[PDB]
């Protein structure tokens, strides 16, 4: 019986009153429009935005911590090299803004050097992520933003084919160029590759040897969140699949890295966590289309100027419920990203990794995406600050969370009544 229910469960009586009232429903749909704009149109005050940013920064941070310690080498087909040095610019190396892949004879692979093929894949994603982070990420609703990315590497050494026509696509190795396009998203990204040779004796060549320099210029690169998450995924999965050998230089006093030698996929907790965050932010960003597809801004009421009938006049309810559920799902995943990495709830070696390295910077606050000679062995990706801002944004989403729960309950009541 129903009266006997609406004693003990008193707020349910209120919910039914609200569901029969077209002005309460319209009020709830208005709220939903406003909470959507906070989630997908804002940056600082959007828990969703902060959680995406956090997931990207953790991937970039992971590499800023460990990249300098990571063997790479060989030639272009993942083959061992007898004498190849391949240097990638704007990368967080030991006391340097480059990373050098100069490990010879050893075959590239698991618990060995990272091949240059994988390194190029890694590097490109890193250069993009750092360029976007530097410009600042757009709010979630924007996906026609693009960014322009430029990066260089060099090849020296007898027999080193990592900058050859075959590796590169470039007509002629001295002075030549090549332009290719592809489609990240349903977007056209234009890539311009150019190659220059600098002889050993050439004037102004400090390094006493001769080398090929490759410049890649990418235009129209998507900076949307779906697109940047796909980059961080590539970054973290390249590392985890190639699983290369690393060994760290340990500082006196300092914070202490264990293990000191090993393989990079051996940080299983750290990599699982980051993969999880990326996955959870990808699902979070997916809720954006659900929200857009179910706009809540047309007012509702009884047709033929006759009282509203929640049993027949409520076919909008399915849509309202999908929208509210999406907004709620976004907020829960945002929170969940935060909890995956937050050191308050971490333990043992993983906690040290995060508090002593990943949530740290040794640059000397320099803006996001900058690589200096002191970036190595620290995250330099604003991880502590991003955690704090996520929590702040969630604290300031108190009211909206309650309004979303209410709209969802109203719609869910109406979906029930129509059956």
């Amino acid at each position, epitope marked *: 019986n129903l009266s006997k229910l609406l004693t003990r469960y008193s707020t349910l009586n209120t919910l039914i009153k609200l569901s029969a009232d077209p002005s309460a429903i319209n009020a709830a749909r208005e709220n939903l429009g406003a909470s959507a704009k906070n989630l997908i149109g804002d940056t600082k005050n959007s828990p969703a935005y902060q959680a995406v940013l956090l997931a990207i920064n953790a991937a970039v941070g992971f590499w800023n911590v460990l990249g300098y310690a990571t063997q790479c080498g060989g030639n272009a087909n993942g083959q061992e090299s007898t004498s190849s040095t391949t240097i990638f610019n704007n990368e967080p190396g030991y006391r340097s803004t480059s990373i050098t892949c100069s490990l010879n004879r050893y075959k590239p692979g698991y618990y060995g050097p990272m091949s240059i093929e994988n390194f190029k894949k890694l590097n490109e994603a890193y250069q993009i992520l750092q360029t976007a982070l530097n410009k600042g990420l757009p709010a979630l609703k924007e996906n026609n933003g693009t960014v322009s990315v430029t990066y260089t590497y060099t090849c020296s050494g007898e027999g080193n084919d990592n900058c050859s026509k075959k590796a590169t696509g470039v007509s002629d190795q001295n002075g030549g160029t090549k332009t290719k396009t592809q489609t990240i998203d349903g977007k056209t990204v234009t890539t311009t590759i150019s190659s220059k040779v600098v002889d050993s004796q050439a004037k102004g060549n400090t390094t006493r040897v001769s080398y090929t320099e490759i410049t890649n210029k990418l235009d129209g690169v998507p900076d949307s969140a779906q697109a940047l998450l796909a980059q961080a995924s590539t970054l973290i999965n390249t590392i985890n699949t190639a699983c290369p050998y690393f060994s760290v230089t340990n500082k006196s006093g300092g914070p202490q890295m264990e293990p000191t030698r090993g393989k990079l996929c051996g940080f299983t907790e750290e990599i699982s966590a980051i993969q999880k965050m990326i996955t959870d932010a990808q699902e979070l960003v997916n809720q954006t289309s659900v929200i857009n597809e179910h706009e809540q801004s047309t007012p509702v009421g009884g047709n033929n100027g006759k009282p509203f009938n929640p049993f027949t006049d409520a076919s909008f309810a399915q849509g309202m419920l999908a929208n509210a559920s999406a907004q709620a799902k976004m*907020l829960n995943l945002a929170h969940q990203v935060g909890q995956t990495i937050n050191p308050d*709830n971490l333990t043992g070696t993983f906690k040290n990794f995060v508090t002593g390295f990943l949530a740290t910077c040794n640059n000397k606050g320099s803006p996001p995406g900058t690589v200096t000679t002191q970036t190595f062995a620290s995250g330099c990706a604003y991880v502590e600050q991003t955690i704090t801002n996520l929590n*702040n944004s969630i604290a300031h989403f108190g009211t909206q*969370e*309650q309004q979303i729960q209410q709209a969802e309950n109203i719609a869910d009541t109406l979906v029930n009544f129509g059956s």
Partner: nanobody
Amino acid sequence: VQLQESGGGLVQPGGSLRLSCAASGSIFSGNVMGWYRQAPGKLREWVAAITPQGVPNYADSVKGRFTISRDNAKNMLYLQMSSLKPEDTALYYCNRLPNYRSWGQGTQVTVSS
């Protein structure tokens, strides 16, 4: 996965009250925590929140009168209420933000002359 509010009672307008919430570690540790209330004939309303680092914020209806705080050593959450009004009469509840989907029993506060 437990939330136990306490401290409520019947008071007079102008009065004050200190609400308490023992929360389990799961819920509490490293999470934003907050207070909610649910008044006669209305749905549950957000009231205050506080980050792990102790930064508090408030609904406009209680700003300047209620103070939220947290004790990280003991997973406790407090709400000091001042200058109570009849309009503050409600069941008060703590939870994390975003909400854990099972609520505690809540603690009744009645402000009345």
